[PDB]
Amino acid sequence: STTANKERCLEMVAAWNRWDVSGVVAHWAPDVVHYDDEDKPVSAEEVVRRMNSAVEAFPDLRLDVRSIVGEGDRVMLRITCSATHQGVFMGIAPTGRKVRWTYLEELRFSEAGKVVEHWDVFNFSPLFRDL
Amino acid sequence: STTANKERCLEMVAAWNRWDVSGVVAHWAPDVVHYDDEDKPVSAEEVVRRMNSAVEAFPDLRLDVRSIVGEGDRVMLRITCSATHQGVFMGIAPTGRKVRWTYLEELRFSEAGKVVEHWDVFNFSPLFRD
Ligand SMILES: COC(=O)[C@@H]1c2cc3c(c(O)c2[C@@H](O[C@@H]2O[C@@H](C)[C@H](O)[C@@](C)(O)[C@H]2OC)C[C@]1(C)O)C(=O)c1c(O)cccc1C3=O
């Protein structure tokens, strides 16, 4: 259970690492809720839009799982992303610069192994400072 | 034990919530390593200094553990801190206003239950968005 959930998370990371958003979404429950930094739900449509925009802005991105821990129906991962800023991002046009940020991803899974709730914490400071 | 490690983490949160940094530091191993935002070690003395400054700058701070997971020798917690910004913090002058941020704390424990490695992930944008 915990083991399976963790492996599911690593498959999502592998999908991001081949720049395939659809492979991440494939693990979502039909009723999945994603919470933003203010704990407000973000619609699936908008979450996917943001994910697609990130791959567009950072098309060479690589995610390094620094740590992963699972207990019960939850998994948390500390991840470092490295990329080059080749596309417009959150309004900031390209720089070509090498960037790097760290973040937490937290997922809660249903008994059938699908993601039902999803949170994160992003430290975009290094990225803003750089850009 | 992970159960035990998790309680220790809750003890650290309770110490923060009574604004007692020393009760946090008590859990550290003598040879603890803390990593800054770029993965470089930060001295235990400098961590203490930053923690002390937060208690002074956010003196009504309250931490609510949103989730906690333990496995093996590690614990991760997602925590939300709510406070009023009353003092200078990292060069940022008080606004007097309510502030709130959510973060990760990851702790690695020795077999005897002392913290040997420590990482954080913060979204401090509420403190400087404007
Ligand atoms: C309420 O304080 C905070 O929100 C921050 C914070 C919080 C914690 C800990 C913190 O050091 C900090 C503090 O983080 C340090 O100082 C920040 C300026 C710096 O960006 C930092 C996050 O890298 C960290 O510096 C080591 C800041 C703050 C506002 O007090 C902490 O060390 C800790 C721990 O060692 C064991 C368990 C829990 C904590 C913890 O919650």
CB B75 within 8 A of CB B5: yes
CB B49 within 8 A of CB B73: no
Q: Which pairs count as long-range contacts for A86-95, CB under 8 Å and 24+ apart, including other chains? A: A86/A57, A86/A58, A86/A59, A86/A60, A87/A56, A87/A57, A87/A58, A87/A59, A88/A56, A88/A57, A89/A53, A89/A54, A89/A57, A89/A58, A89/A131, A92/A131, A94/A57, A95/A131
Chain B residues with CB-CB distance to A121 below 8 A: 78, 102-104, 121-123
Best interface-test mutation with B: which of A7, A103, A104, A120 has the largest number of B CBs within 10 A? A104
Structural domains for chain A? 2-130 (3.10.450.50)
SS3 label, residue B100: strand
How far is it, in rounded angstroms, from Cα B99 to Cα A46? 26
- What is the experimental resolution, given in Å to one decimal place? 1.8
**Structure determination technique employed:** X-ray
Bridge partners, residue B28, by sequence: B115
Structure tokens at B96: 């007097």
How far is it, in rounded angstroms, from Cα A64 to Cα A82? 8
CA torsion, ordered B57, B61, B65, B70, to nearest 10 deg: 40
As for ligand 1, residues whose beta carbon falls within 6 Å of it are B 12, 16, 24, 34, 36-37, 42, 47, 50-51, 54, 61, 63, 81, 90, 105, 118, 120, 122
Chain B residues with CB-CB distance to A116 below 8 A: none
Beta carbons of A69 and B71 less than 8 Å apart: yes
Bridge partners, residue A41, by sequence: A35
Return the amino acid letter for B83.
A
